[PDB]
Every structure is written in structure tokens, then in C-alpha cells.
Ligand binder design. Structure first.
Ligand SMILES: N[C@@H](CCCC(=O)N[C@@H](CCS)C(=O)O)C(=O)O
Ligand SMILES: [Fe+3]
Length: 329
């Protein structure tokens, strides 16, 4: 069978405060985990995850087939040509078991300059009716800002870990323009579970989603307490243990580009488990025009032979690529 991945628990609460030495000792732990399996659990993060999970369960269990079509992205509903990222991603029963709801920055309103310009990757969120889902929109928008705050603090820790000043990433991660997304994913219990909805890895492992690197700077994930993720390491795929009190953190491929693969984006995959569960990732993306010049923390002059890449170019190309590689979610 499969060995357990080294996924350390890191107390990130110093990243919210003003004790600089304490922040450096957290940054060393982020450096060590980023150089090893590429995952860690952030603990003492301050977010009420049990309430997050209850509000998300109340949504997923009450939304109706009618509302799903009315919120659906354009892959499922040709009438919704402006919904590429934000909205409902339907299951196809008998075939594709998972379903999800994605939303973006609540500041992308109709008056926002990037929405007015129809800039790629910016959309206005769609929401179910308030009378059918009382409090859901307000809860989900507040959640966005709670996990934005955690992610800002983690970005301070990654900056310090790389030998940079603490706002090195955080200065590009801003409420008015971040391209970050929340996805509320439901994995169902089904009996019988359709075989068509189960993928098979080359090593025979049954999967819900195949190997990939994330399209993100970092990913900040809350999951139910059901083991399912695996990370590829030099010793093969290893199981990431569950912990539904902490947030599971890893780097995405923009971090790997910026750092010349010093912090790799770890390749990971989702095992098939026949269980009713939740997966609530926040993909930490910067602004459309954000560019950070690539560097290499293993080279004495810190220079890299990678070209600067704007975050908007990275994100539009990555979201398309991920769909082409592993299919429409
Ligand atoms: N819709 C989100 C991005 C979602 C990206 C995505 O599907 N990631 C999956 C890939 C599994 S094959 C994952 O990390 O498990 C957005 O528009 O920001
Ligand atoms: Fe992923």
C-alpha cells in the first residue's frame, strides 16, 4: 500500500502579528515544507471552518435542478456566454459525479473597470435567489474576505521564506483586483457509483481527478475529514492525511515559475472515495497585470533564465490547459 506524505502542521498565527522573529520561524517551516512534499497544514488560522462547512452543506443539499441550470457556466448552458469561470458546474448522473459552484472577487461588479472592458478572466458572480438560500450570498462573500485575509498572511510567510520583504507577493494581492476564486465542490455518495465517473491511474488507483499542478500562486484548501488526496514524490504517490481543522496549503505553477522551480508546484491527484464530502479550495491569484520578475533563490546572484509572465496571461492559458488535460469539471 501507499506511504503517508510528510505534511507538517505549521502554526501560522505569528503571520497576523508584529513579532518579526516569530514570523521568520514560521517562514522557515514554510520553506522546509515547500522544498519537501510541497504541502503543509496551516493551523491556528482564525477561520471558523465548521460554520463554513455547515453553510456550504445547507447550499449543496438544497439547491434544485432548476436553479443549477439557471446558474450554470457556459459549458452546460449555451445561454450564459459570459460565464466561463463563475457559476454552477453540473454533475452528469451516470457519468460525472462531482458538482461545484465557483465564485470570484465580490468587487467585480458591473461598474468595475475590468468588467466594463470585458477583460478575460473577470466576471460578475451569479447567485441563487435570496428567498431560497437565505444568507448564502452574504456568508459566501464574507468567506471570500476571511480566506483572502488568511492568504495574505500566508503570502507574507512565503515572501520571508524566499529571502524577500514581507509584502513581496501581498502587494500584488489586492481586494480591488484579485483574480482569486472560491470553489464549493460536492463529492457525492452514490450507490451504485457509476464506473464511468471513476478514472483509473496508471498504477491502478481509482481517481475522481487525475494528476495536475494547480493554476494558482498558492492554493488554500478546506476539506472534509475523509482522506483522498495524493502527492507525487520521489518515492511515488503518497497519501496526504485529512485534517478538517486546518487548511491544506500548496504552491501552484506561478510560484514554480517565479522561483525557477525552487518551490515546485507539487503534482497531486484526488482518489475516488464513495463518500458525501466537501472540498472548498481558494485559488490565490494576483491581478490581471501583476508581474513579478522571476528569480532563483539557489543562485548567488538570484538571476533566472525565465521570462516575466503577467498573471492574467498565466491564468487564461492555465485554465484552458487544465480543462484540455483533465476535462471539464
Ligand atoms: N474554476 C476555477 C479553477 C478551478 C481549477 C480546477 O479545476 N482545479 C482542479 C483540477 C482537477 S482536474 C483541482 O485543483 O483539483 C477558477 O476559474 O478559478
Ligand atoms: Fe489541485
Amino acid at each position: 500500500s501507499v506511504s503517508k506524505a510528510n505534511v507538517p502542521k505549521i502554526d501560522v498565527s505569528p503571520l497576523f502579528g508584529d513579532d518579526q522573529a516569530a514570523k521568520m520561524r514560521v517562514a522557515q517551516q514554510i520553506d522546509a515544507a515547500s522544498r519537501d512534499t510541497g504541502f503543509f497544514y496551516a493551523v491556528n488560522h482564525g477561520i471558523n471552518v465548521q460554520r463554513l462547512s455547515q453553510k456550504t452543506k445547507e447550499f449543496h443539499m438544497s439547491i434544485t435542478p432548476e436553479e443549477k441550470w439557471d446558474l450554470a457556466i457556459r459549458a452546460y448552458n449555451k445561454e450564459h456566454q459570459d460565464q466561463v469561470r463563475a457559476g454552477y458546474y453540473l454533475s452528469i448522473p451516470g457519468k460525472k459525479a462531482v458538482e461545484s459552484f465557483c465564485y470570484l472577487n465580490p468587487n467585480f461588479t458591473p461598474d468595475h473597470p475590468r468588467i466594463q472592458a470585458k477583460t478575460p478572466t473577470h466576471e460578475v458572480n451569479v447567485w441563487p435567489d435570496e428567498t431560497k438560500h437565505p444568507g448564502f450570498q452574504d456568508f459566501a462573500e464574507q468567506y471570500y474576505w476571511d480566506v483572502f485575509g488568511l492568504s495574505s498572511a500566508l503570502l507574507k510567510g512565503y515572501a520571508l521564506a524566499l529571502g524577500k520583504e514581507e509584502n513581496f507577493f501581498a502587494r500584488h494581492f489586492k481586494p480591488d483586483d484579485t483574480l482569486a476564486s472560491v470553489v464549493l465542490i460536492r463529492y457525492p455518495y452514490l450507490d451504485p457509483y457509476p464506473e464511468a465517473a471513476i478514472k483509473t491511474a496508471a498504477d491502478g488507483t481509482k481517481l475522481s481527478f487525475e494528476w495536475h499542478e494547480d493554476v494558482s500562486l498558492i492554493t488554500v484548501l478546506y476539506q472534509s475529514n475523509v482522506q483522498n488526496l495524493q502527492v507525487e514524490t520521489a518515492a511515488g504517490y503518497q497519501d496526504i492525511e485529512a485534517d478538517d481543522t486546518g487548511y491544506l496549503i500548496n504552491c501552484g505553477s506561478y510560484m514554480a515559475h517565479l522561483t525557477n522551480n525552487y518551490y515546485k508546484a507539487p503534482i497531486h491527484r484526488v482518489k475516488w472515495v464513495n463518500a458525501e464530502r466537501q472540498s472548498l479550495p481558494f485559488f490565490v491569484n494576483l491581478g490581471y497585470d501583476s508581474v513579478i520578475d522571476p528569480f532563483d533563490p539557489r543562485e548567488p546572484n538570484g538571476k533566472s533564465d525565465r521570462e516575466p509572465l503577467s498573471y492574467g496571461d498565466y491564468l487564461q492559458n492555465g485554465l484552458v490547459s487544465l480543462i484540455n488535460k483533465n476535462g471539464q469539471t
